Amino acid sequence: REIVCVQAGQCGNQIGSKFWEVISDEHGVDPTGTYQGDSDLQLERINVYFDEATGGRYVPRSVLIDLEPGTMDSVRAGPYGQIFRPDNFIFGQSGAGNNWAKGHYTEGAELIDSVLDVCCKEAESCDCLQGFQICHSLGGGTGSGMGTLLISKLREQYPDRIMMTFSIIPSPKVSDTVVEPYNTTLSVHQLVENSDESMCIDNEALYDICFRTLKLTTPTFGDLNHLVSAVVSGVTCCLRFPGQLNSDLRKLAVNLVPFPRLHFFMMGFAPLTSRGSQQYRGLSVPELTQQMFDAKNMMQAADPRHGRYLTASALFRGRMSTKEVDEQMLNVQNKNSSYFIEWIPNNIKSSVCDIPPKGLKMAVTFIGNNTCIQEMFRRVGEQFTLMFRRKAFLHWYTGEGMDEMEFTEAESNMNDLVSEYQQYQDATIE
Amino acid sequence: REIVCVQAGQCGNQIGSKFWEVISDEHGVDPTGTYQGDSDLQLERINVYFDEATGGRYVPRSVLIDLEPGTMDSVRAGPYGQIFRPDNFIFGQSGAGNNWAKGHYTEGAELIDSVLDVCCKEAESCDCLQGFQICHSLGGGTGSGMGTLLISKLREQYPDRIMMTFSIIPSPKVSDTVVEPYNTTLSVHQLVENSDESMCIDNEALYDICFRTLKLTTPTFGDLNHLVSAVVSGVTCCLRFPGQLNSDLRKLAVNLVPFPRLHFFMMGFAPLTSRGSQQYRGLSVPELTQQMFDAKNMMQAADPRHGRYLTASALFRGRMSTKEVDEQMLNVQNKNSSYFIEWIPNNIKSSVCDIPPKGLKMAVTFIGNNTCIQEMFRRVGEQFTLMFRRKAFLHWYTGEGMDEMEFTEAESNMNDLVSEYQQYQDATIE
Amino acid sequence: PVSPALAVQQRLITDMSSSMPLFAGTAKVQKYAIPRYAGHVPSFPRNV
Amino acid sequence: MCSVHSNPLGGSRSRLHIAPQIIPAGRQGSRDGTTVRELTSNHYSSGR
Amino acid sequence: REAICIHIGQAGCQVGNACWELFCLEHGIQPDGAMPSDKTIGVEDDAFNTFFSETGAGKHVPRAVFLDLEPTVVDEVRTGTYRQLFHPEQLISGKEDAANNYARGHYTIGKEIVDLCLDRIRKLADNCTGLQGFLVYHAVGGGTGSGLGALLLERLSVDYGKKSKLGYTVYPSPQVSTAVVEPYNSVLSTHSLLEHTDVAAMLDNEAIYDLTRRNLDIERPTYTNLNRLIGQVVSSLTASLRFDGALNVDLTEFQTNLVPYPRIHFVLTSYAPVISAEKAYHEQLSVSEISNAVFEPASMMTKCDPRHGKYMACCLMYRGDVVPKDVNAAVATIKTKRTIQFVDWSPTGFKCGINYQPPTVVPGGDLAKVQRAVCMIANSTAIAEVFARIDHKFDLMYSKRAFVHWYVGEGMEEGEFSEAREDLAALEKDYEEVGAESADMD
Amino acid sequence: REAICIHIGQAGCQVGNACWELFCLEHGIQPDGAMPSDKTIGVEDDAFNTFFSETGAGKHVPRAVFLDLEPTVVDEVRTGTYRQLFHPEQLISGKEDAANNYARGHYTIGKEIVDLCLDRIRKLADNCTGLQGFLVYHAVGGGTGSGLGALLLERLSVDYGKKSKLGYTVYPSPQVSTAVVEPYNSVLSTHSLLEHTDVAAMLDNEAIYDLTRRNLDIERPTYTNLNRLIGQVVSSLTASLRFDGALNVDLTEFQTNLVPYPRIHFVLTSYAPVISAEKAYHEQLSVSEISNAVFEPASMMTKCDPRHGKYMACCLMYRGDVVPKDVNAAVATIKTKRTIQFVDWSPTGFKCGINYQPPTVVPGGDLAKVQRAVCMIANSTAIAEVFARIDHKFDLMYSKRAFVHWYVGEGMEEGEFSEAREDLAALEKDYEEVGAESADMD
C-alpha cells in the first residue's frame, strides 16, 4: 500500500525535505541510500514510501515542481538532497509572479503535461496504489495554482483512489503577501470539489506552539517544518508497522467525514514538552489525553471552545494498554459532553501502534473535525470582499485572461461552505 | 547463413566503419585479423559476417563504393581499416556533385560493372547466401542514385533473396542540401518497387535522443553512427547465437509486412540512459518494455500517438523468462488498445536470445510498422510540389538527360503510397 | 618570448602591423586609452 | 614556431597549428569524456 | 537571473560608476575583470551571472551600456581605472549635447544615435536565456535624459514587449535647482514615462542631503556620497536575485504587489542603518528598531512627507542575519501604530523579504559595517504633492511662453505643452480619486 | 583535389600576392619553396597538393599564372621577395596596357598574348590527375581585366568544356569611383561573363572600407588590407578541399546548389569574425552569435541591402571548432526571424559545411586570432538594384555618345553597346520575374 508524494512551491518543497529527513531517519536509510537499520521491522514495509534501486539503494517516490530552480537548487544542495532521483526534478524558466492566473493558465499548462507523465510513470510501477500525498501553501502563486491544477488532473486520472493534501493557509496576523485573499479563495474553491481530505496549518499556531509549549528562544522555519513533518509522518505510521488495532487512510475517511463536503480537519501531536521538565513526569495515557485535547497543542488559530466536534481520531504509537486508551476516551467524552455533537453516540475513534518514534516511550497524533474552521474561512471571505469591491489589483489577473465571473463564483462557493458548517453547528432535534 | 554488406557514399561508409568495429569487438577479432575470443559461442558462427583467409585471418564480407576517395582514405587510416580487403575498395575520379542524375546515369554506368563483379565474386563464394545489407543516405547524390542502381541490379540477379536497407532521410526542420526533395522522391520510388524492408532514421531524432535521454553536452556524428551501428548489429543477433525462440530476417518479414507495399519501419534500442541516472534504476523486462514504446526512444520525428500500429517486433537478448515477455506484450496491447489495428488479433512478435552484448545484462531492439510514416512522405511531396511547379533547379537533371515524366511518375507513386497508408489507417470491419 | 598576459595579447598584433606610420594621430596608437577614443592624440614623436 | 593540432571532434590526419604563442580569443567550448559507448556498454561503471 | 543595465546622460553614468564599483566589490571581481588567481574557494558559484558574462579565458565583462551625447564623461570612463572592464563598443558617445532641450534630444540629435543603442541592446538580449528586466538610470531635468530616455523606452517597449522596465530617476528638487528650464523637461519626460514604465522609483537630492546631514555627520557632502547611497539601494533590491535566502522576491512580484492600477506605479525608497563608524559601536541594532526607522520621515531619499497621505502597499527587504519572527513582530508592531494609515481597500498591506547576505563594506566608504539592514519600497498617495508643485512651476513659466521659441525652433509644436500639462493634471485627479474612502452601505 | 588559379591585371595580381602569402603560411612552405626540416609529419600527407606541386628535389611550386599587359606589376613580383617561388615562365607580361579600353584588350592587344596563356594552362592541366575547377581573379572596371578575361574565359570554355570555372570579381562601387569609363567596361565585360561562368562573386571596395573602419579601427586603409581579407575568404571556401571535416564541400556542389536558372549565377559574400585583437578578448564568439552576424548587413563585403529582396539559396561554411548540433539550432533560429525572407518556391534554403581547421593568423595582419569562423555565399534578388545603377549611368553617357570614338577606333561596332544594354535589361527582367509569388492555384 504505497503513497506517491508531490511537493509544490517553496513552502511545499522545504516541508517535503524535512518530511523525507524524518522518514529516512525512522527507517535507517543512509543519505547515500544504503540500508543501515537494526531491525527487520524497518525493512518489511520500506516499499510503502521507497522504491528499490539496484545494488542495495533506495529512492524516494516524490515529484518536485517549481517555476525557478532556486528552491530546487537549495533542496538538491541540502544534506539529504542526493537521495532524490534526478529525472524527478521539474522546473521552468519564469516565475508565477505571485499571480494565481499566471501559475494556472500561462506557465502551468506549459509544464503540467510533463508532471502528469512523471506521476503516471511512478504510479503504474506500484503493485497496488494507495492515495497520493501533496504538500503546498494556499497563499502563494505557483503553489496554489499548480497544486490545484495537478489535483484536478490526478482526480480525473485516478478517481477511485484517495487524494490527501497538507496545506499552509494565511495567518490573520502574518501578512507575507498583499494578494493572499484572491489566491486562497480560488484555491479553496478548487479543493472543496476536488479533494477527498485536506489538512490545514497556520504558521501562527506553530509560532505559539514553539514559544509557549517548547519555550524556544529563537525559532526558525526548520522547527516549524519539523513539527509538520512529525504529524505528516505520524498519520501514515499505522499503514507501515504492526499494532493491536490497525487503521488505514480510507478507514479514517469513512469514520471522520459524515457528508462529502465536510472534509477539512485539524491536526495535533501530544508529547511536546521541554527537555527540562520531561524528567519530572512520566508519559501515560491520561497525560497524553490531557495534552491531546488542550487547545494549546492544536495547530489552528480557531479555538475548539467556539465550536463543536463532529468526530475525532487518535492514533497511538508505543507499548501501552488498550484499557487506559478506552477509559480515557470514554471519560473525556462524558466529562466535556456539551462540546460533542449529540446525534453521534461515540465521537472518538482510537488506534494503537506498537512502534513509537525513536527516543519517545509513547506518542499519539490527533486529528480533529471541528466546526470552528468556519471562522477562518469567514476571515478570508471578509478580506476578499473588502478588496473586491474596489477592483484593488484585478487588472493583473484579467490581463492573464481570467473572467471576473470566476471571482464571484469562488466567493459564492466559499460563502456556501461557511453557511453549511454553521448550519450543521447550530442544528437541533425536537 | 551469411550476409553481404554494401556501404555507399559518405554517410554509409562512416556508419559502416563503426558497424564493423562493433561486430569485430563482439566476435573478438583483433585488428590484425587474428581470432582472440574467449568462448566457442563467438567462433561457431563467425562465418556469418567474415570469410577466412589463410593462417588465421578473417576478412569482412563488405564492398566499399564511393565516387571520390576522400572517405575511403579516412576509413583506411582508422584503427580497424586494415581488416578490409584491398580489392573491395572501388572509387572513381570525380564527385557526384550532389546530383541524383549524375550519380545514377553518368558515373554510375561507368563504375557499376566493377561493383557488380565484386558482389558476384562474393556471392558465388557463399555455400548458401542470405540477404544483402545496404547503408546509404537518401538525401545525397551518389548514395541515393548509385545505391538504388546497385540495388536494382542485385534484385535482377538474386530475385529470390531478401533485400534490406538502412537509410538516412531528411530532417523536417533544417536541410543539409537544397535539392533534397528530388533525390528523396526518386530514391523512394526505386525502393518501394525493389526493396523487401527499409529502415529510416532522422538526424533530428538522434539529436533529441542524445539531448533528452543521454543529456550529452556536445554530441558528435560518431555518437549517431554508434546508435545506428547498435541497431544494425542487433537485428541480426538471433541469426548468429542460440536462444529459446529463434528468429530470422525472413521470419521478421513474414510477420511484419501485411501487404507488399507497407514495408517501411521505425527502429529503437532500449537501455539508453545517462551516466548520472544509471545508479537509480535497475534493468528489468517491465522497465525495458515501458521505455521501448516511449516515442522519446524512437529514431524518427513522427510520433506513434498520431497513428496506429499494424505490427511490431521485439528481439530480446539475455537470460530472462518467457512469461514476463508474453504477459508484458499482452498488457501493453490491452491497455493501449485504441492504438492497435483491430482486425489483427495480435500485433507484437517476440523473440528471445541467450547471449546479450558484452557489458549489458539484457537488451532489446524494437521494429515498428506504424501509419505515421505517411506524414514524412506527405511533407516530402509538399516540398517537391513547391519546387517542381517552378522548375527551380531542374535544368541540371534534364541536362544529364532525365525526362520530366520520371518526376511525375515518382510524385504519383509517392502520393499513392500515402493514400494506401491512409486507407489502411481508417479501415473498419463493417 | 610573448607573455600570455591580456594586454600583451591585445597590443601584439598592432605592434607588428605593416602600416604603422599610417596609424599616427588615431586612437589605435594611444596605449593609455581603450580604442575608439575621442580626445586629442598627438601625431609627432616629440609630442608623443 | 609550429605545432600539431589535436583531434577532439574527429578526424585522423595531422593538422598544423601556426604561431602557438598568440593565444586565441573567444570562448572555448565545454568538453567532457562522456561518449556514447561509455553509456551503451559500460553498465559495470559501479560494482554495487 | 539576468538583468541589463542602461545608463543615460550625466547623472545616470555617474551613478553607474558607483553601482559597478559596488557590484564588483561584493562579488570580488578585480577592476580589470579577472577573478583573483590566488583565490581557491572552489565553490565557483553562479551568482555573478546576473550581472556578468564570461569570455572563456576567465575575464568578466558587465551587462551594461553607457550612453551620452557629450564625450567628456565617457572619455573619463575610457581613461579611468575600469578601462579594461567594459567592452569598448558598449561605451557609446555622441558629438554634441542636447543643450537642455528635450526637443533637441528627441527630434534632432538622439535620432541619429538611437539605432546604435538598439543594436547593442539586441546583442546583449541575444546572449541571455532568462532575461527578467531592464534597469534604467537617468535624470528627467536635463535634455539628454529626457529626450533619449523617452525615445529609447518607446522603442524598447515596441521591440521587446512584455519584458519589465524599472527606472531609477533623479527628479528636480523642490527648492534646490540646477537649470532654469527644469519644469518643462520634467513635464515632457513624465508624459512619456507614464505610458512606458512598469515601476518608477522617486529620488530627491534634498532628502539625500538631509539624510547625510542628520544620520551621518557630514556638513559638506558631494555627489560621490549620494551615488554610493543609490548604489546601495539598487544592490539591496537586486540582492534577492543573487544570494540564498528565506523569502525571495522575483522582479515580477514587485509589479504584482506594488501596483494596484496601471498608472499608480510611482514609489518611494528608504534605507535604515545608514550610520557612521563612531556611533556603530555604541548601539545594538535589532530588527524592531530599524523597522521603526524605515517609517520615520528622517529616513526617506525622496522629499515628500508621508504623513499627508495613505499607504497602498509596502515591500520590506531584509538582508543579513535576520530571523522571520523578528520581522513578523516588527510588522505587527508597525501595524499597531496610529500615525501609520493604510487605505481601507488594502487589508494585507505588507510584503516581506529575508536574505542572508549582509551589506558590503566599501574601502573608501563612509558607512559602518553592520550585520543586518532593511530597505523599503512603498506606494503612497503623498507623491501627488510633488507633481502639484512641478505643475504650478510650469503654469508660472508657461503663462508668457517664456522660453518656448527654443523648443519650437528646435522642432516641437507648441501644442505638445498643453497636451502634457493636461495629462499630468489627469494624473493628479487619478491620485485624488484612488484615495477616496467610500461607504458601500448606501 | 587540384585547382588552378588565373590572375589577370592589377587587382587580380595584387590580390594574388596576398592569397599565395596566406596559402604558404597555412601549409608552412617558405617563400623560396622549400619545406623546413622541422615541419615533420607523423604520417605522409597530401593537403598541399591542391595548391603546390613538387619537382622531386623537394622544392614547392604553385599552380598559378600571372597575366598582365603592363610589365610593372609582374616585374614587381619578379624583383620582390617571392622571386624563387613562381616559375619564371608562369609570369607573363606584355609591353603596354589596355588603357581602360575593353576594345583594345579584347581585339587589339590581348589577341597577341592569349596563346601563351593557353599553352601555360594546358601545361598545368597535363600535370594533374583530378583537376576540379578554375579560380579566376579580375576586375571588370578596367580594360585588360574585362577584355582579356572575357577572351581567355571563352577559350577555356571551348577547350576544357564541362569543367567548372568560378570567378571572384571586383565590381564598380556605387559612389566611390576611379575612372570615368567604368560603366561601359563593366557592361561589356558582364555580357561575355554571363555566358561563360558558373558562379560569380561580387565585391565592392566601399564595403571593405566600411568594414575596416567600423569593425577594425583603421582610419586609413589601403589595398593590402582589402586583399588580405579577400585571401582569407578564398582560404575559407577552399579549406573544404584541404582538411578533414564533418561535412566536406566539393566545388561542383556549389554550382548545383546555388544556381536555380542558368543566368541567375551572381552571388553575395560575407565573413563573420572580422574583429580587432582588443575587441576579441572582451567577448565570447559562439556559433549562434556569428550565425546571427553573417545575416546582418554590417557583415557584408558588397554594398547591397538584402532587406530589399528575397533569398533563394544560402551556403554556410563553418571552419574550426564547431559541432553540427549548434549549426542546426542556429539555422533554425535564423529561419524563425521575420526580417529574413526566402522565396516561397525554395523551401530547403540552406547548405552547410563543417571543417576542423581554424582560420590562420598572419603576422602582419589586422584580424584577431579566433577559434572559429563562418563564411557565407548567398543568392538574392537584391543584386538587381546593383545592375540598375550601372545601367542608368550607361544610359546617361550613351544618350550623347560621350566617349564612343575611342571604342570605335580600337575595333568595335557601335551595335555592340545596344546588344549588351539589351542583355542587361533582360537580366533585370529575369530578376523581376523570378521573385514574383505564384498564387494562381485555381
Ligand SMILES: Nc1nc2c(ncn2[C@@H]2O[C@H](COP(=O)(O)OP(=O)(O)OP(=O)(O)O)[C@@H](O)[C@H]2O)c(=O)[nH]1
Ligand atoms: N545625484 C546626482 N545628480 C546629478 C548629478 N549630475 C547632475 N545631477 C542632477 O541632474 C539634473 C541635471 O541633469 P543632467 O544629467 O546634467 O542632464 P544631462 O543628462 O547632462 O542632459 P544634457 O544637459 O542635455 O547633457 C540636476 O537636477 C542635477 O542636480 C550627479 O552626478 N549625481
Ligand SMILES: Nc1nc2c(ncn2[C@@H]2O[C@H](COP(=O)(O)OP(=O)(O)OP(=O)(O)O)[C@@H](O)[C@H]2O)c(=O)[nH]1
Ligand atoms: N580591392 C582592390 N581593388 C583594386 C586593386 N587594384 C585596382 N583596384 C580597383 O579596380 C579598378 C581598376 O581596375 P584595374 O585593375 O586597375 O584595371 P586593369 O586590369 O589594370 O586594366 P588596365 O588599366 O587596362 O591595365 C578600380 O576600381 C580600382 O579601385 C586592388 O589591388 N585591390
Ligand SMILES: Nc1nc2c(ncn2[C@@H]2O[C@H](COP(=O)(O)OP(=O)(O)O)[C@@H](O)[C@H]2O)c(=O)[nH]1
Ligand atoms: N512554515 C513555513 N512557511 C513558509 C516557508 N517558506 C514560506 N512560507 C510561507 O508561505 C507563504 C509564501 O508562499 P510561497 O511558498 O512563497 O508561495 P510560492 O511563491 O507559490 O512558492 C508565506 O506565508 C510564507 O510565510 C517555510 O519554509 N516554512
Ligand SMILES: Nc1nc2c(ncn2[C@@H]2O[C@H](COP(=O)(O)OP(=O)(O)O)[C@@H](O)[C@H]2O)c(=O)[nH]1
Ligand atoms: N548520421 C550521419 N549522417 C550523415 C553523416 N555524414 C553525412 N550525413 C548526412 O547525410 C546527408 C548528406 O549526404 P551525403 O552522404 O553527403 O551524400 P553524398 O554526397 O552522395 O555522399 C546530410 O543529411 C548529412 O547530414 C554521418 O556520418 N552520420
Ligand SMILES: [Mg+2]
Ligand atoms: Mg550634459
Ligand SMILES: [Mg+2]
Ligand atoms: Mg593596368
